[PDB]
Amino acid sequence: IVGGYTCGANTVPYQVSLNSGYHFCGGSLINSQWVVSAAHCYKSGIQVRLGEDNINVVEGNEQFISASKSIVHPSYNSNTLNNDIMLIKLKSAASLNSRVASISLPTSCASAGTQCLISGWGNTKSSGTSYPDVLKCLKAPILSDSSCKSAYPGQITSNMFCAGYLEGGKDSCQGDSGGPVVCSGKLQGIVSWGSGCAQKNKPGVYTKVCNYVSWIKQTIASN
Template structure:
């Protein structure tokens, strides 16, 4: 790699960082909505990072040092601006999940992790309806570090998206969909379905929510949160909560799922009780996360899977 090539990469890096800074001076209000600009910047920043990572291994010693400085600059600047503007796009206040401890966790991948999902069988994945794509996406199973090969992964293309017929994109009611895989997954200790609920979760149930977020971190994050009462949920979001939604989290704020976790699992006592759906900001006081109430959809899920 010659000096002119390195200079062009440096100019491109700084130009993209400037564009990201300018865009994310405007904050995002609801975690469920994404603009095309947001998505394109996410993809561009990750693509450029990957280019820099490849170039790091192909130059002389001086160029390698320069590339590494650019790579760290890219990570530092994009992490700061994505996080500050979006109240972070990943689980807030959580911890790194023990490796492969959430074998039902799925990543919906389109150049980056744009939504989560939940493995229900060797052929079916559950997610949020607002995560539906107009084109096929890569469904990633058995992942822990989303950007590093670990010999546990299975990457399978989607074959069909089936959102619930009552899904309302304005209110996010019935925000749930099934994804049929293009081929069956191999079930093992790294890739294993979660059980559907035998009954609805009661207030106070302790649950686990997990996800990667859109931008960072690379490794799967976990958070232990309680299910809140219906009254608390309704009072947190007056006239916005339906009977098909539950709230989970802490009213004092500081811990919550977020944008990039949409479609991911809320599991209580080994059963899937919620799908990450929406909320105001992330981890804000008196604004807990809102989840699709899976126990209301067990019949639809089973019927759809059986007829598929």
């Protein structure tokens, strides 16, 4: 997160870190046994880390649970990033509490102008590299489909939306991938892609979660 703020420990209780020896992507807890992330975050050997603030210190609210199964969206295209979504099932159920909590899935899509909270442990510089230890947060609005398409000609599908600031300076970044975009208490987006970070006229691009709720619910019901 570039241009954001320190969230505060466990104030984003559905935020997870995906760990394969090191943090490499975010995710969102959607029930006691399932996590939603970005397909481009797929790898084997995932440990899900719940309850994290400082990802380099054991502070007392963590739950570390191995993935038992990963399911990349059937139609994921790694070249275009269309359908950049994946589900991860935990080997055991998380113990849900005030600091480790699921986020509601949307019943309807969000609209341009709605404010949302984006979070993660990704890079905090746009012309630099600095990775935070504690969770960072950014409040940002959804942008219109037309301004999204104008920012990224020929690249925005119906499964993508833009959010952030055309002026630059405030965005998600490398290492935030897979993490949440939550709007009015609903998971509406997944950190997916963008040209650099926090660059003028190059807002973040997010997977549009509302398009996937049918797939998510049926997948959970059969696995």
